[PDB]
């Protein structure tokens, strides 16, 4: 049983509840000197499209979607709990906006098939960005000017060097990828020592890598 | 035999009990100067969907479900006893929310068969998350960029070294 009358509106509830979703201008709010139970300014603070149904775990329940940006806020109310939690998730709501300023000239060279957005490519300078969902998540490898140069810089920064560190670490595994994300690391029988042999031939890659320990 | 009349409501009990589940605004509560036996503010404190039926082991009994999030609270009242116990379980109620912020862009690439949620996969960066229930519990191995690299890093961190210890 709480009520408020203003702006050409007599809203009278009785023996049950009903909260208001703001949309007010200069609304007086309290009467009889007492409050409704506490004024709630949507400026300081329940965030736009999601109302606080909240339970013991202080999680927000009710929420509505309208746009992708709204879906972010819709998600926000779920992983938000204690202060640091809601703050992180709150930021993640905006953080997950469009491509956070890679360059000025941003179109949308996205690949799509029958309405469903297939893959989201995005190439430019020191980076080729590939977001997929039917074969993984997202991959972005920085270049310098060309795709090749990405492979080059990677090839320079490749793992076959750390082999010496691992030697001292205690267990020599020896891994080494390839420029084009080529996977070459394998696993030998090495409780302590027992070599590392492998011989590939025929139309594929005639290369035998024999390694001793 | 306790009673309260307000907000267009004459609630009079007699010779037996009946507690109220709040839902009040500005309800006066005590009369004749005396109390009902003690005011119970649901703000400080019995937690939302679960009422304190409580026995010698101070455990909450009655509870209702509505959503998954509610089921967490429903569970909460069971493993909660002494302070440190109820606090831990109380936290676990919220702690067990959705995937606690792995990344921003979180959809729901879960595998399901005939209504029953089969398995819950979740891949991204430095981690592939696989929650199952028909062949175990949950497994999450961190990578660096690719599945292979997870295997690599693991291969480096493998046990055959401790043999000397």
């Amino acid at each position: 049983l709480q009520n408020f009358r203003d702006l050409r509106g007599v809203l009278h509830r009785t023996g049950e509840e009903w909260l208001v979703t703001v949309q007010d201008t200069e609304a007086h709010v309290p009467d009889v000197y007492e409050e409704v139970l506490g004024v709630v300014p949507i400026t300081t603070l329940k965030s736009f499209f999601l109302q606080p149904g909240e339970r013991l775990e202080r999680g927000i329940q009710d929420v509505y979607v309208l746009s992708e940006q709204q879906g972010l806020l819709l998600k926000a109310l779920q992983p938000l709990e204690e202060g640091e939690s809601e703050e992180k998730v709150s930021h993640q709501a905006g953080d997950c906006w469009l491509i956070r300023g890679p360059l000025e000239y941003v179109p949308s060279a996205k690949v799509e098939v029958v309405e469903e957005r297939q893959a989201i490519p995005l190439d430019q300078n020191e980076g080729i960005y590939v977001q997929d969902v039917k074969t993984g998540k997202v991959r972005a490898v920085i270049g310098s000017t060309y795709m090749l140069t990405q492979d080059e810089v990677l090839w320079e920064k490749e793992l076959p060097s750390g082999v010496e560190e691992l030697l001292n670490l205690g267990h020599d595994p020896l891994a080494d990828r390839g420029q084009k994300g080529t996977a070459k690391p394998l696993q030998p029988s090495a409780p302590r020592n027992k070599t590392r042999v492998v011989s590939y031939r025929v139309p594929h890659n005639a290369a035998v890598q024999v390694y001793d320990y | 035999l306790q009673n309260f009349r307000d907000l267009r409501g004459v609630l009079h009990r007699t010779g037996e009990e009946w507690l109220v589940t709040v839902q009040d605004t500005e309800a006066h509560v005590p009369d004749v100067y005396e109390e009902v036996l003690g005011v119970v503010p649901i703000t400080t404190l019995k937690s939302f969907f679960l009422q304190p039926g409580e026995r010698l082991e101070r455990g909450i009994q009655d509870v209702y479900v509505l959503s998954e999030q509610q089921g967490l609270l429903l569970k909460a009242l069971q493993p909660l006893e002494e302070g440190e116990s109820e606090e831990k379980v109380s936290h676990q109620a919220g702690d067990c929310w959705l995937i606690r912020g792995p990344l921003e862009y979180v959809p729901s690439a879960k595998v399901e068969v005939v209504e029953e949620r089969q398995a819950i996969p979740l891949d991204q960066n430095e981690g592939i998350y696989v929650q199952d229930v028909k062949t175990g519990k949950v497994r999450a191995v961190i990578g660096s960029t690719y599945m292979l690299t997870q295997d690599e890093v693991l291969w480096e961190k493998e046990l055959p070294s401790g043999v000397e210890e």
Binding site: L7, Q23, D24, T25, E26, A27 | -
Partner: protein, 49 residues
């Protein structure tokens, strides 16, 4: 404003932005006395409820 109800009291208004006029009547003023703000260059108002 006697008991429960209101005698005659009324809250409504309108403004005279007119140049040249004494203003006060029977000792009291209209309600306030202000000179021109010299209005809006590139401002506006947002009307809500």
């Amino acid at each position: 404003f006697d008991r429960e109800g209101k005698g005659r009291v009324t809250g409504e208004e309108w403004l005279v932005r007119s140049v040249g006029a004494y203003l006060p009547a029977v000792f009291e003023e209209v309600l306030d006395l202000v000179d021109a703000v010299i209005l809006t260059e590139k401002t506006a108002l947002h009307l809500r409820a």
